[PDB]
Amino acid sequence: GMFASLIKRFQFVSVLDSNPQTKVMSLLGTIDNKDAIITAEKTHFLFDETPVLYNCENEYSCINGIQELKEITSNDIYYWGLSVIKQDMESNPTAKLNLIWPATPIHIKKYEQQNFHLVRETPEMYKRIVQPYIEEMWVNNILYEGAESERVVYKDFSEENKDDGFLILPDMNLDSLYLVAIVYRTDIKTIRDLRYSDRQWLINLNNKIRSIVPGCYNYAVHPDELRILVHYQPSYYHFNIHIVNIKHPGLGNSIAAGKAILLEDIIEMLNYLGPEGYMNKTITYAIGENHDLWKRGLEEELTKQLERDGIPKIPK
Amino acid sequence: MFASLIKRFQFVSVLDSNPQTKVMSLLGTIDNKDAIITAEKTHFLFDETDGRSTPVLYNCENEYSCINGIQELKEITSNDIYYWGLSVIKQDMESNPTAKLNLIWPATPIHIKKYEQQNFHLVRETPEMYKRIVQPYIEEMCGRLKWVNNILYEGAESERVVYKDFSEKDDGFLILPDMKWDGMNLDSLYLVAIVYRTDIKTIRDLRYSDRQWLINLNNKIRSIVPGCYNYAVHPDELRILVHYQPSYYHFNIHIVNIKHPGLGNSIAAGKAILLEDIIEMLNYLGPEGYMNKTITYAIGENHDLWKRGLEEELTKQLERDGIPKIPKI
Ligand SMILES: C[n+]1cn([C@@H]2O[C@H](COP(=O)(O)OP(=O)(O)O)[C@@H](O)[C@H]2O)c2nc(N)[nH]c(=O)c21
Ligand SMILES: [Cl-]
């Protein structure tokens, strides 16, 4: 058919994304010299037509379709291996497969996933490389011009909170609750600007978030079921706090050590860093290759750090 | 042994199902003793394709790579520039297995509680809470570590060990594939470094005086692991971390391809802490190190520590923070 025929003509150019968490792979290519994107995703296991009430009686349900097993290794009560399972177009297909063609630049930009590098960012690196970049720098539309006011979940209005206040809105199933609190202060561009003197304010924000969010969802999510965190590097240089259901099943990098830092941890660390706060911290995090800071000095500094630590690397 | 045990598995119930990650856990029995099987679909594959050879990264020439193994396609529907369908792909034990399986047997109640679906709670654990609630539990828990000692002293998984640094003691460690890793796809590379010293049960036991030792472990790991895989992964592409609470009370360091977004909490803030961060934080805590820290983390409601005092203490913390009690109605 049409679909099969188009897939057969697909000429591979490059891999856009490979995600071992979700078992998704996206490929850039061409069909009739026009750009094309194929996305493939492994199917989930099947259950008989909570998860604790599912069943495994039917032919293709659960692990019933195993044709072949092979051990990797074992130890005491733990055994693990690999399996081949019977596939079938109607009852147990192997993967979902989508095609975008002709694909536009916007589609390609959407599906390309960048590579990351662990950097160790010292105070001096921040001052020399990062700080000047931040200064050279839609949030304001939301804060001061009413943009997306229909979507806002909570907003401070009183004169007392003109500076220390904030608003909360969703990020663009209750398990997948994901909100962002954007503060009214304009002098905090990243966690680097948090001083010891800001600690009580952060504690107050943490307490407000947990006092308010549950009531917005009729106490269907509890205050202790919110993973409240910030990012470094953040996606935008105006301080903001991510509020995520602790059970959110969707997420990978956005909640990962190396990117996300718990608000409670920010708070606790400010007891020890002295007056200038996170200005004094050496922060190890994952920086993306597409980020402007990579070529502005982080790459060069990482190679020097590896040399100092006596770590083997491939040269430039 | 493995195959034989899987074949005898009698299903009892589904413990958990995650369609995002394509992971499923099943409770059952083998010889009328409890057993847990966890299954995870494999990821897609790519080519395994001075006088040094660079690995050809993300290519699709080979038989089983990318979408070359498609035997059958079926369109669901299509519209405008979009086509949506399904595929059947050729499976093969050696070159394209369908799913990784883990088996725990005989499984203990602790294992079952761990894998059952449960609520999770962000807890704030103060030094006093550690001393009163957690520390006594650790002492009881230290049978459960039989697998660690098997690797260290009885040759278990010796064939897979990638690095071993041991003179006959307390300074050394070894590195091998973590039970999580299917051993085939480098995007999900996941290794565990197990230390030989036994006096460190968790990060709580790390003092300021342990800092240089941790720096040395970090350096060795990054100096060794990449060369084991022909630099298909670089030293700066390893997310190296520890867990609190860990499942097992023996200091273990998790080494994960940075490209792996992570199953459940294995790399998540609230569970995972970067080794570099452990190292850096020791500069600011006292001599007693993480014993002085208030540590906030995610714990499951079935964990033994929940009813042993963390639940009661979390309620009191919420009151002190002026967080409202949930109305009964
Ligand atoms: C019993 N066992 C557990 N692991 C891994 O050891 C690490 C233990 O680290 P942990 O943080 O205590 O466990 P958790 O992530 O479940 O909380 C985990 O990544 C397990 O996947 C294991 N890895 C190997 N190679 N062999 C084993 O017998 C074994
Ligand atoms: Cl068709």
UniProtKB/Swiss-Prot annotation, chain B:
Stated regulation of activity: The hydrolytic product 7-methylguanosine diphosphate (m7GDP) efficiently inhibits the decapping scavenger activity and acts as a competitive inhibitor in vitro.
Q: Which Pfam families match?
A: DcpS (PF05652), DcpS_C (PF11969)
Sites where the protein binds substrate: E157, K180, H243, Y244, Q245, P246, S247, Y248, Y249, H250, F251, N252, I253, H254
GO molecular function terms noted in the UniProt entry: 5'-(N(7)-methyl 5'-triphosphoguanosine)-[mRNA] diphosphatase activity; exoribonuclease activator activity; hydrolase activity, acting on acid anhydrides, in phosphorus-containing anhydrides; identical protein binding; protein heterodimerization activity; protein homodimerization activity; RNA 7-methylguanosine cap binding
Q: Key word Transmembrane helix present in the record?
A: no
The UniProt keyword set, sorted, is: Acetylation, Cytoplasm, Hydrolase, Phosphoprotein
Where is the catalytic site? N252 (nucleophile)
Cite a GO CC annotation: perinuclear region of cytoplasm
Return the protein name: m7GpppX diphosphatase
Source organism: Saccharomyces cerevisiae (strain ATCC 204508 / S288c)
Give the encoding gene's name. DCS1
